[PDB]
Design a protein around this ligand. Structure first.
Ligand SMILES: [Mg+2]
Ligand SMILES: [Mg+2]
Ligand SMILES: [Mg+2]
Ligand SMILES: [Mg+2]
Ligand SMILES: [Mg+2]
Ligand SMILES: [Mg+2]
Ligand SMILES: [Mg+2]
Ligand SMILES: [Mg+2]
Ligand SMILES: [Mg+2]
Ligand SMILES: [Mg+2]
Ligand SMILES: [Mg+2]
Ligand SMILES: [Mg+2]
Ligand SMILES: [Mg+2]
Ligand SMILES: [Mg+2]
Ligand SMILES: [Mg+2]
Ligand SMILES: [Mg+2]
Ligand SMILES: [Mg+2]
Ligand SMILES: [Mg+2]
Ligand SMILES: [Mg+2]
Ligand SMILES: [Mg+2]
Ligand SMILES: [Mg+2]
Ligand SMILES: [Mg+2]
Ligand SMILES: [Mg+2]
Ligand SMILES: [Mg+2]
Ligand SMILES: [Mg+2]
Ligand SMILES: [Mg+2]
Ligand SMILES: [Mg+2]
Ligand SMILES: [Mg+2]
Ligand SMILES: [Mg+2]
Ligand SMILES: [Mg+2]
Ligand SMILES: [Mg+2]
Ligand SMILES: [Mg+2]
Ligand SMILES: [Mg+2]
Ligand SMILES: [Mg+2]
Lengths: 59, 50, 49
RNA sequence: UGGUGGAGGUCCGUAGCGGUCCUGACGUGCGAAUCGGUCGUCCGACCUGGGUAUAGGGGCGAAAGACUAAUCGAACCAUC
RNA sequence: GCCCGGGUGGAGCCGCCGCAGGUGCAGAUCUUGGUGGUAGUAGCAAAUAUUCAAACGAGAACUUUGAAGGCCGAAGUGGAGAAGGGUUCCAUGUGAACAGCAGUUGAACAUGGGUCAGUCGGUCCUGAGAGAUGGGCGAGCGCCGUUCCGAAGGGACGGGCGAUGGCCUCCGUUGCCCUCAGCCGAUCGAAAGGGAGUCGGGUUCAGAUCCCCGAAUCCGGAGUGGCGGAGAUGGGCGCCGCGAGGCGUCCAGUGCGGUAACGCGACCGAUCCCGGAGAAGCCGGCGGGAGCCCCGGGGAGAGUUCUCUUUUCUUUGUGAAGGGCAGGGCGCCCUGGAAUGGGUUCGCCCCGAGAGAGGGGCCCGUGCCUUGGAAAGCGUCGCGGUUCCGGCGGCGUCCGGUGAGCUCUCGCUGGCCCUUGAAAAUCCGGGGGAGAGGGUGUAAAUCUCGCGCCGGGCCGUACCCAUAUCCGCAGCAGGUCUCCAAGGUGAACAGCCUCUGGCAUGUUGGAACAAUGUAGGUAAGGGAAGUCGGCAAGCCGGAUCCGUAACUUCGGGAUAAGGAUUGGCUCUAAGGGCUGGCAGCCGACUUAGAACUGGUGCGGACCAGGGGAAUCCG
RNA sequence: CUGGGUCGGGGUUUCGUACGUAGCAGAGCAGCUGCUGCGAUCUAUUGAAAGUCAGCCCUCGACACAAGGGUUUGU
């Protein structure tokens, strides 16, 4: 995901959990050379990423 | 430098974002006098101050 | 895509010359550049003795 | 007398630092001070990075009026 | 100066009477802009070097692939960082401009991508220093000053009062009182100082100690603490029971062992006090351990095979964290008491303030074995997915020896100082003994022991790091801080050649080989007659064995000066370890002597002091 | 039916005696009971081998080539 530079890892985890009613294993955040924060969100093993991406709209 | 501060990185990001050329639909508006981007900066020529 | 073999750098010549030096060749007073002490330190000799 | 030991602002000499001579090259140059051979020193008053202090009639000077951002027998900038 | 004609042009302009002025250019090394001759000229010459074939393409000296010949030569033209740069990184596309020739190429242009951390750093500490308040000064913005002309603590074990919540039990939350007591001065100051804790394998076009897999680890937290184990369960008496074992009274129980160094899995404890670690220079010598190099073999795969070569080359392993054992060190302990002095080092040094000789203890154990761990990695041979695959299979990853060898690291010991070579954060041990627990048990308070539960937020992370990504106006022969470091020769990290890795000759090529240049050489006879002046060039040069003057501050002069030798090959002699005056088995480089031999040549390239006699000055 | 050119062959000349093979030549050394190996060098083949126009001399040997191409010029 792309998030704003004012978000903690805890905030990103909570936002994903509320929005997409899923579980998050961990979060890794970096700040792109162009300015916004990029977040890699690793889900729980019992949730697969492909179906969540389906529900999102990106396939 | 690999070690850099947050504000330095943000300023660099803004400067890098500013370096694109103009959109092709600009030059054929009605009240237009712009032919190209005259503020483009190359890393070899001008050294960004700092 | 093959990995080419390493170009040969043999040691047969230098080991044959080393065998000659073992026998005592090429070690005359003509073929020596350092001092006697530099070639074999007298302190080390005395230590061993 | 023979060993041993391993001192030293010690000697030859690399790296490093410096810059004698050719008054060589170049001299609208590679370069607003470089290049080559040859040279001085190379465990100590040694060489060097970063941090920090000293600001213009002031600083700093193993002292040449030297250095103080290619500017120094008084820096640079703006104004009068 | 002006009026007409012709042409171009496309929207304003002039005559006369007055009024007003920023009103007339050939120059001012005038200002700005433009353009010539020079001139298709100077020039595109620092660091050895390129050639053949094919492909793509309109187009090839410069692109790509293959082959050949070269260079850098581990103090690199290699592999990574710091500062600085800031998208230059990666993929695709283009060839207008730029890359001083060209380009199918680019650090150019155009589209898109790319930097993932509890453990790597910042973040914290303080250093040299910087800087508020109090105070002082100052017309004033302000300045001085950093403990100095200050009521500088907003904390706490515990006790008492008052209220609340939770089974109001016991504790928490406060509010008040009693009691307890320093600060070296707020705060800032290091991406090289201090600073707990992450390693291995795999993966991308570009990211990995960060992603995935697998093994760990530090810190912090937890009403009921989740749990084990420790604190712990004994003795006496009266008994019962044949005894085993079981009852009723008393008493103890904040662990135990070793003579000692000290050991064991824990083994209560506050304010306070003491100490340690953090926390220390430069140089020398020696020893231990790794990595690398080296030698003799087993494999596996390659190279040569005109002749020879049991041949030449490549490869042949195990992380962190535990456990054990080597191996190093001890200014640690016990017995005993030594001259006929002894022990011992390369050197030293040690001993009645207790040596030798026995027996122990402690610390580091980065080495070996094991858990990890063969399951992974790698080298080969063969099958698959005709591919999109951490694909599947076989085999192997073995045995030894040495070294004043190089680098790193640990340790011992000494030398030098009119030089004595940081602070704080943080952590730990001890001395004390204020307190707490229970009355014999369901034991309690308390545990730095074992396992178990939860979490670790924020920022940086791509690439260059330099004869093209930095600074010099630039792809500038300049400058710019570091780590890694093979073989041969050789004293050597010197010079020369080569391997791993890299590169295409430094912003162009072809053909000629005149003068004059720049940079190298060689010259008959003479030998400084040249020149201001032996400027430049030239002679000498390493090592071994002889020999070495005047003068002297007695240390030097000194490599003084001056001589001889140096190759190749075949021998001899001497210099050691381990096991059982001796015997056997291994072995690493040296030194000396001799013979033979070459067209007198042998420090054969490279490296590499000309000398002497005096004067002046310091 | 002539020409040069390339290659080859001779001549000249430079250097100094090639590789291989053989040797009861070789300071010596090791192994097997006189023989076999290592061994710098030496002797014979060996005035040998190699080079020799690119700006040397002759060839009458071989090979292919050579009756071309372009631009101009009138009293
Ligand atoms: Mg630049
Ligand atoms: Mg000296
Ligand atoms: Mg000159
Ligand atoms: Mg000139
Ligand atoms: Mg010297
Ligand atoms: Mg002053
Ligand atoms: Mg003067
Ligand atoms: Mg003045
Ligand atoms: Mg108009
Ligand atoms: Mg006007
Ligand atoms: Mg004019
Ligand atoms: Mg020209
Ligand atoms: Mg490099
Ligand atoms: Mg690199
Ligand atoms: Mg690129
Ligand atoms: Mg060009
Ligand atoms: Mg991890
Ligand atoms: Mg102040
Ligand atoms: Mg700080
Ligand atoms: Mg730090
Ligand atoms: Mg003793
Ligand atoms: Mg395996
Ligand atoms: Mg990187
Ligand atoms: Mg060249
Ligand atoms: Mg070139
Ligand atoms: Mg260049
Ligand atoms: Mg050049
Ligand atoms: Mg002469
Ligand atoms: Mg002569
Ligand atoms: Mg004269
Ligand atoms: Mg001279
Ligand atoms: Mg003298
Ligand atoms: Mg005199
Ligand atoms: Mg002097």
């Amino acid at each position: 995901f792309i998030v704003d530079v004012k978000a903690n890892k805890h905030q990103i985890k909570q936002a994903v959990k509320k929005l997409y009613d899923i579980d998050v294993a961990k979060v890794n955040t970096l700040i792109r050379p162009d300015g916004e924060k990029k977040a890699y969100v690793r889900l729980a093993p019992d949730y697969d990423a492909l179906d969540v991406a389906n529900k999102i709209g990106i396939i | 430098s690999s070690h850099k501060t947050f504000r330095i990185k943000r300023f660099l990001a803004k400067k890098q974002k500013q370096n694109r050329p103009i959109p092709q639909w600009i030059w054929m508006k009605t009240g237009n006098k712009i032919r190209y981007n005259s503020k483009r900066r190359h890393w070899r020529r001008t050294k960004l101050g700092l | 895509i093959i990995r080419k073999p390493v170009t040969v750098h043999s040691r047969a010549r230098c080991r044959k010359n080393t065998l000659a030096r073992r026998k005592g060749r090429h070690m005359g007073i003509g073929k020596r550049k350092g001092t006697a002490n530099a070639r074999m330190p007298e302190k080390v000799t005395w230590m061993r003795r």
